[model samples]
Target: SMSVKKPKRDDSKDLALCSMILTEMETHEDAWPFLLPVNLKLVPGYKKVIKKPMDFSTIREKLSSGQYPNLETFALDVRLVFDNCETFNEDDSDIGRAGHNMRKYFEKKWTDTFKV
Candidate 1:
């Protein structure tokens, strides 16, 4: 079972936070290996949903164009990436800690930076 928890708050501020996290993931190459699964297409033995890696740029473009449905969807996607890392790596592994630290940074700075 995936441990990713969906965000409870679905406001525009939450959308902003999700975008910030996505931007950070894009800028930090060192975080790529652990977070790359966010761009993958998974199959459940029968067939493949997406054959190629997801182009995250499309997400940013959508955000800029105000086409996203809600912050909840974006938050779930971000959480899924972290859940993938946690699923594959040990709790104390570098990738695990990296994910933890990223989340920690976001939680810590969310209010201070976004005032929400």
Candidate 2:
């Protein structure tokens, strides 16, 4: 008499995958502008335009703190980092170009890894 129980996911596997992808993004050349918080002195009024800023270091902390319930939440937070960059930096600017590159890179890696 065999009965099946509800399916369970291995959160540890999901977390490790997220951690791997995040580390790649952090080291990418396009990650320069996003390595740290946007310096207020360098980019004045940045805080005003970008209400919720994000960076590699910040996301690293969130992961360490186990803030993301799943990979989806982790992906969303990572998206915000690049999305905010594109929102604030002009299309012709170096920072803005990197945002597009970073977004595309993550999207491809996500699809390739998760196929979702």
Candidate 3:
């Protein structure tokens, strides 16, 4: 025998359901079914060009020295990191891991590379 239950609908119930769905989708492995179809994560090596200090400083120098004529193009690199994270990881787990990893990564990569 199979049992089926119908969920009751009311303002409070609806709100609760929405909140639960959001939480589930934002933190679990099942989230792919709920997100937009076209989202793309950054390629793994893309970080070799951004999160690394040498690459970051190169872009920084260009912007600071006014070598980049287009401020928008220069700014895109900064924005891409955040955007890619959101698009790739609609759930917070991947994003949180990325943040933790970045700190661990940069600390080792630049311990003696920078004064401050």
Top candidate (lDDT)? 2
Question: What is the descending lDDT order?
Answer: 2, 1, 3
Question: Per model, how many backbone clashes are there?
Answer: 0, 0, 0
Candidate 3, lDDT over the whole model:
0.40
Q: What lDDT does the true structure give each of the candidates?
A: 0.56, 0.88, 0.40
Candidate 2 residue pairs that clash: none
**Collision pairs in model 3:** none
Quickly count the clashes in candidate 1. Answer: 0
Ten-residue segment with the worst summed lDDT in candidate 1? 45-54
The digit string of per-residue lDDT tens for model 3 on 1-116 reads 25776763333333333234234323545333323322225345444433422223344444556565543354444344334544445445855465344434433433332222
C-alpha RMSD for every candidate:
9.1, 3.7, 20.4
Q: Which runs in model 1 stand beyond 4 Å of their true positions?
A: 1-18, 38-67, 109-115
Better of 2 and 3 by TM-score: 2
Model 2 misplaced stretches (Cα beyond 4 Å): 1-10
Q: Output the number of the TM-score-best candidate.
A: 2
TM-score, cand. 1: 0.51
lDDT of 1 by residue, 31-102 (tens): 555433343335342124333333346556666777767765554555555555565557787777876766
In terms of lDDT, the poorest run of 10 residues in model 2 is: 1-10
